[PDB]
Amino acid sequence: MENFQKVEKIGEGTYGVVYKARNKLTGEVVALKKITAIREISLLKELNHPNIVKLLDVIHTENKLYLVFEFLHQDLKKFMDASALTGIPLPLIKSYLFQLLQGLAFCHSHRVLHRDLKPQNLLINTEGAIKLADFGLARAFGEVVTLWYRAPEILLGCKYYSTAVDIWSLGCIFAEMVTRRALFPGDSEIDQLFRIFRTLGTPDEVVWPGVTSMPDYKPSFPKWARQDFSKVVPPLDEDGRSLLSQMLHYDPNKRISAKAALAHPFFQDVTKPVPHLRL
Numbered sequence: 001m002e003n004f005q006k007v008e009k010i011g012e013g014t015y016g017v018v019y020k021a022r023n024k025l026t027g028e029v030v031a032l033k034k035i036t037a038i039r040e041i042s043l044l045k046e047l048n049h050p051n052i053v054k055l056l057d058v059i060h061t062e063n064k065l066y067l068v069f070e071f072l073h074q075d076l077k078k079f080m081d082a083s084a085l086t087g088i089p090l091p092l093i094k095s096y097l098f099q100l101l102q103g104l105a106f107c108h109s110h111r112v113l114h115r116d117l118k119p120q121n122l123l124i125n126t127e128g129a130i131k132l133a134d135f136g137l138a139r140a141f142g143e144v145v146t147l148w149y150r151a152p153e154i155l156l157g158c159k160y161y162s163t164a165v166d167i168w169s170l171g172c173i174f175a176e177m178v179t180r181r182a183l184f185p186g187d188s189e190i191d192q193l194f195r196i197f198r199t200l201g202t203p204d205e206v207v208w209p210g211v212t213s214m215p216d217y218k219p220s221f222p223k224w225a226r227q228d229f230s231k232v233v234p235p236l237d238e239d240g241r242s243l244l245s246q247m248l249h250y251d252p253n254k255r256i257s258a259k260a261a262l263a264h265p266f267f268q269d270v271t272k273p274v275p276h277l278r279l
């Protein structure tokens with residue numbers, strides 16, 4: 001854009017290139033993303049919450065779309081890589097999960113889904129805050145994209161997925177912060193689906209009614225037994241493992257909502273620590 005002075009290139013997203021920019025008039029530092037869609041994006045400008053990255057403006061010029069966002073100094077992916085030797089302390093993991101669930105509860109109450117939650121679109125500041133970026137952009141529009149945080153209902157071909165997909169994604173991220181390794185690191189749709197099955201057990205009509213009738217379900221899927229959560233996410237306590245299991249329930253209807261997750265005993269001693277950020 002003409003009104004913005006590009007500082008540097010942040011990275012490459014799912015829709016386009018993300019830039020760090022400065023407004024020539026106001027002097028504000030922003031994040032500029034270069035991409036019926038116009039109306040859906042304009043609805044997200046009103047979706048404001050302290051845990052949702054603020055969409056400042058929507059610029060439509062020369063058949064190209066520019067999305068102006070609030071700037072945050074680091075993403076969760078880079079923060080995880082920078083804390084891989086010592087580990088992100090548990091009180092900070094709990095704070096992050098609590099704040100992200102608050103942001104999810106807000107958007108979900110307004111019927112807005114993320115659909116593509118990953119450590120890369122979770123942004124953090126020096127104040128101990130964590131924010132969700134690119135919310136609702138999947139409904140508006142539609143490099144290898146990661147399947148690691150994708151819910152099984154999406155992998156099994158369900159066209160009409162719910163808010164429960166974001167809970168699954170956040171549960172995979174929760175597990176990753178604790179273990180310092182991706183929960184389900186799939187490199188294909190079937191590898192993703194089979195890694196889920198190997199850990200949580202191949203779903204049947206008992207744990208998930210209607211799973212055998214799903215578009216991409218195949219009766220030939222190998223039958224693996226469920227592994228205990230104590231083996232999946234050590235040294236996470238009983239409260240955390242219980243919340244994780246409810247966030248990772250196969251059936252989208254049994255899967256805990258963001259609002260109910262905020263009331264879970266794991267958040268009894270939740271606080272808001274300040275992270276160690278070297279920018």
Ligand SMILES: O=C(Nc1cc(C2CC2)n[nH]1)c1ccccc1
Pocket residue numbers: 010018031032033053069070071072073074075078123133134
């Ligand atoms: O992504 C970063 N910043 C950012 C991105 C965003 C919006 C465009 C979604 N706001 N702030 C970032 C990551 C690492 C280092 C510096 C900046």
